[PDB]
């Protein structure tokens, strides 16, 4: 358990800000919503503020706050994300789309007042102009995944490896290979975890009254993989 954990015992407002650049196409996204870590529950709405999003919304779901995961009581000593709070952590990823381009992301996740903020810069290169991504061939939905977490003692943080499965309209599934590293922003002690995983499930939807390009996200994340 940690002092950081005490900041998540109720409903927490969330802001998400992303600046992106994919094959030179520049875009910005703002998101708002809230998280309730007691139930591993996230509710977020994202709006593309620069017009039409040049990549499919599902490809950005993992980039758009694992501190809202529900860690079962017997596992709470393994919750790095909340222990890094309020000072926060940096989350870096490489995301490799099978036989297409890749995203590189850097995010800072921290409290600003009572708000959990995720500020992201994203760089995408080597995408095929009529591939699944720039050609918008992904179904608008999202699969359930298990994300394995392990300690990275030398960076006083964690790392994760996982594959995201994106449904493709023609019936195939395209894998997005995620390599992730998280390191605390502050200098204080953090909880470093034994090996475990996060079990995720996400539902994507639309706001019928919204005229801008957007995504509504409902997500549940639960930690598992450690016996009690």
């Amino acid at each position: 358990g940690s002092k950081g954990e005490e900041l998540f015992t109720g409903v927490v407002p969330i802001l998400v800000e992303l600046d992106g650049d994919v094959n030179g196409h520049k875009f910005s996204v703002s998101g708002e919503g809230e998280g309730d870590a007691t139930y591993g529950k996230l509710t977020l709405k994202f709006i593309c503020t620069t017009g039409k999003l040049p990549v499919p919304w599902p490809t950005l779901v993992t980039t758009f706050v694992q501190c809202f995961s529900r860690y079962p009581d017997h596992m709470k000593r393994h919750d790095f994300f909340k222990s890094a709070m309020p000072e926060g952590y940096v989350q870096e990823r490489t995301i490799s789309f099978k036989d297409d381009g890749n995203y590189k992301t850097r995010a800072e996740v921290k409290f600003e007042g009572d708000t959990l903020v995720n500020r992201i810069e994203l760089k995408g290169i080597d995408f095929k102009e009529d591939g699944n991504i720039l050609g918008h061939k992904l179904e608008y939905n999202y699969n359930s995944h298990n994300v394995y977490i392990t300690a990275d003692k030398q960076k006083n943080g964690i790392k994760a490896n996982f594959k995201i499965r994106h449904n493709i309209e023609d019936g195939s599934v395209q894998l997005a290979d995620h390599y992730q590293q998280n390191t605390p922003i502050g200098d204080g002690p953090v909880l470093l975890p034994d090996n475990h995983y996060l079990s995720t499930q996400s539902k994507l939807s639309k706001d019928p009254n919204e005229k801008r390009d957007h995504m509504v996200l409902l997500e549940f994340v639960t930690a598992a993989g450690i016996t009690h």
Partner: protein
């Protein structure tokens, strides 16, 4: 893929679809400027599925009877979640016989 027509209610969601149809039709101009009044029964929708073995929901299609400027129109609207903008006015014809 696409399922069968099902009756839906004429609540706010449906009335807003009506409003959308009239606003879109107003952009073309083959009729004079229309003023939305109401969607009347029956309204119906069919589910649209991705064309593959998963067959998950891609969106919906709507067929509405819409009163605008005191005339009854048939409006067909498609909703496609994969591509922005999602709502498109497919057809808008009138006046038509009352259902």
């Amino acid at each position: 893929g696409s399922g069968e027509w099902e009756i839906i209610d004429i609540g706010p969601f449906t009335q807003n679809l009506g409003k959308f149809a009239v606003d879109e039709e107003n952009k073309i101009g083959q009729y004079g400027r229309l003023t939305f009044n109401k969607v009347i029964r029956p309204s119906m929708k069919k589910t649209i599925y991705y064309a593959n073995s998963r067959g998950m929901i891609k969106g919906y299609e709507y067929q509405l009877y819409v009163y605008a400027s005191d005339k009854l129109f048939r409006a067909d609207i498609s909703e496609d979640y994969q591509h922005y903008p999602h709502r498109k006015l497919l057809r808008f014809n009138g006046p038509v016989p009352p259902p």
